[PDB]
Structure 1
Amino acid sequence: FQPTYGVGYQPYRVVVLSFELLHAPATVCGPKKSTNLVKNKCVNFNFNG
């Protein structure tokens, strides 16, 4: 790899993400949605299921 190397020949960093589904409990997941707390109004809620 050289700086004068043209496109398609320059050093490109590559990270492969391999996903697997073992029967063990899932650990890595996504973030929350938060929203905002509102009171004294008939609403619906999803507090941790």
Structure 2
Amino acid sequence: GFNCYFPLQSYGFQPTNGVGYQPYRVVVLSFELLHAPATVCGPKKSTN
């Protein structure tokens, strides 16, 4: 009603939008250091 709105809105994504309104996929990598064993480690720099 007046000054009452559903809090969510849709993004009207179209290929015709300028770049700032084109959709972007965002993935954020949150890296956690817990008491748990580390389990996520990059490759080992081994040699001959």
TM-score bracket, normalised by the shorter chain, equals: 0.5 to 0.7
1:7 aligns with 2:25: no
What does 1:1-49 correspond to in 2, within 5 Å? 1-36=13-48
CA deviations on 1:17-49 (whole Å, 9 max, x unpaired) are 11111111100101022322xxxxxxxxxxxxx
Structure number, greater radius of gyration: 1
Aligned residues: 36
What is the Cα-based RMSD across aligned positions, in Å?
A: 0.9
Where in structure 2 are there 5+ consecutive unaligned residues?
1-12
Distance 1:27 1:8 in 2: 38
% of aligned pairs identical? 97
Amino acid at match of 1:25: P
